[PDB]
Design a protein around this ligand. Structure first.
Ligand SMILES: *[C@H]1[C@H](C(=O)Nc2cccc(C(=O)Nc3ccc(Nc4nccc(-c5cccnc5)n4)c(C)c3)c2)C(=O)CC[C@]1(C)C(=O)OC
Length: 353
C-alpha cells in the first residue's frame, strides 16, 4: 500500500515510498544496512533491516535494548532514531523491522587508514569521550567499543553505532561479535568491570590511529593477554593478589616482561615532525596514553579527567559533555521473557511514534 519493495542489496527490502534509490552500504559490522534518500526530509538516510528479531532469545535482547535506547538518547555523538517502521500490519504475521538514522560517510576504521593531525585527532577522541560520559550518565557501560562500532561524517562529527554488550564472556552468540582486540584486562581476566573499562578501549583506538595498526593483536583468547603485558609490562604485585585463584597463578606463571616505555612504543618520528607544537602535543598524547593504557583499573584515568586533559580540554564545550542525562522507561532492562512476549513488546515499541 504505502510500502514498496526493492530486491537489490541481496535481500527483499520493503520501505516506505519516501526512501528510494536504495544502495547497499553493508559491511563486516553486525547487521546489513543500505543507503537511501528520504524525500520528505531532504536527507540521505541509512536503513537497516533487522532479520527475525525474535528468531531466538539472544537476538531479541539485543534488538529490544538498542531500540528503546536509541529512541530516547539525544546526543550529537550517539546515533539517533529518525523513524521506525515495519511493513507487516499484524502482530501474528509480524516478521521484520527497519531502522532509519542519519547517514554518515565512513566508519572510524576507514578514517584510521588516512593518517590525521593533532587538531583532528583530538576532536575525534573528544567526541568519543563525551559519548561515553552520556552513556555512563544513564548507567550504561559498553565494553565493546571498537573502530567498527564508530561512524564519522566528513566534517569529523563522530557517532557511536552500538550501545554495548549490556550486562554480563568472550564466547558470545550469533548476534554479537567478540572483537577482542580493543578489550581491557578486566574483560579478559573476568575480575569485574567498572566505568573505567571504556577508557582502555579508546586508548587502543588512539594508539591504533598513531601506530597505524592494532596495538594488541591476539590470535586466541589469551594471546592478546600475552601481547598486552609484552609491551605495556608485567602487572605489578598488588594487582595480581585480587584476581580469582584459578587464573591468578596463570598470570604469575607466564614469562615475565619488563615492558617497553611509551617513549619508544609511540616515538615522535611518526608524529608530526618539524613542528614543535605537534611535537609538544605528541608529548600531550603520550602523557594521556600513559594515563589510559594502564592495566590496573582502579588508578586508570576517568573520562571526566580525560575530558579535562590538556590534549582534549581545548575542545571542551558543555553542550556535548555536561548534557542532561538520558532516562530509560524497560525498567526491567535487566530481565528476559518469552519469545512470543519478546515479539509482542518490540511490536509495541515500533508502533508507537
Ligand atoms: C575496517 C576496514 C574496513 O574494511 N572497513 C570498511 C571498508 C570498506 C568500506 C567500509 C564501509 O562501507 N564504510 C562505511 C560506509 C558508509 C557508512 N555509512 C553509514 N552511516 C550510517 C550508518 C551506517 C551503518 C549502520 C549499521 C551498519 N552499518 C552501517 N553506515 C558506514 C558506517 C561505513 C568499511 C578494514 O580494512 C579492516 C576492517 C574494518 C575494521 C572493518 O570495517 O570491519 C568490518
Amino acid at each position: 500500500n504505502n510500502f514498496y519493495s526493492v530486491e537489490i542489496g541481496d535481500s527483499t527490502f520493503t520501505v516506505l515510498k519516501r526512501y528510494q534509490n536504495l544502495k547497499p552500504i553493508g559491511s563486516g559490522a553486525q547487521g546489513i544496512v543500505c543507503a537511501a534518500y528520504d524525500a520528505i526530509l531532504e536527507r540521505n538516510v541509512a536503513i537497516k533491516k533487522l532479520s527475525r528479531p525474535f528468531q531466538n532469545q539472544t537476538h531479541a535482547k539485543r534488538a529490544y535494548r538498542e531500540l528503546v535506547l536509541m529512541k530516547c538518547v539525544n546526543h550529537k555523538n550517539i546515533i539517533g532514531l529518525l523513524n521506525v517502521f515495519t511493513p507487516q500490519k499484524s502482530l501474528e504475521e509480524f516478521q521484520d523491522v527497519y531502522i532509519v538514522m542519519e547517514l554518515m560517510d565512513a566508519n572510524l576504521c576507514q578514517v584510521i587508514q588516512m593518517e590525521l593531525d593533532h587538531e583532528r585527532m583530538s576532536y575525534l577522541l573528544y567526541q568519543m569521550l563525551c559519548g561515553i560520559k552520556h552513556l555512563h550518565s544513564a548507567g550504561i557501560i559498553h565494553r565493546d567499543l571498537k573502530p567498527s562500532n564508530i561512524v564519522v561524517k566528513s566534517d569529523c562529527t563522530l557517532k557511536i553505532l552500538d550501545f554495548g554488550l549490556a550486562r554480563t564472556t568472550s564466547f558470545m552468540m550469533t548476534p554479537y561479535v567478540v572483537t577482542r582486540y580493543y578489550r581491557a584486562p578486566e574483560v579478559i581476566l573476568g575480575m569485574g568491570y567498572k566505568e573505567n573499562v571504556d577508557i582502555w578501549s579508546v586508548g587502543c583506538i588512539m594508539g591504533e590511529m598513531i601506530k597505524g595498526g592494532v596495538l594488541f593483536p591476539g590470535t586466541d583468547h589469551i594471546d592478546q593477554w600475552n601481547k598486552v603485558i609484552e609491551q605495556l609490562g608485567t602487572p605489578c604485585p598488588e594487582f595480581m593478589k585480587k584476581l580469582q585463584p584459578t587464573v591468578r597463578t596463570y598470570v604469575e606463571n607466564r614469562p615475565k616482561y619488563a615492558g617497553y616505555s611509551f617513549e619508544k612504543l609511540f616515538p615522535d618520528v611518526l608524529f608530526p615532525a618539524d613542528s614543535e607544537h605537534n611535537k609538544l602535543k605528541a608529548s600531550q598524547a603520550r602523557d594521556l596514553l600513559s594515563k589510559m593504557l594502564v592495566i590496573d583499573a582502579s588508578k586508570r584515568i576517568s573520562v571526566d579527567e580525560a575530558l579535562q586533559h590538556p590534549y582534549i580540554n581545548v575542545w571542551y564545550d558543555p553542550s556535548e559533555a555536561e548534557a542532561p542525562p538520558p532516562k530509560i522507561p524497560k525498567q526491567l532492562d535487566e530481565r528476559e521473557h518469552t519469545i512470543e512476549e519478546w515479539k509482542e513488546l518490540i511490536y509495541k515499541e515500533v508502533m508507537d511514534l
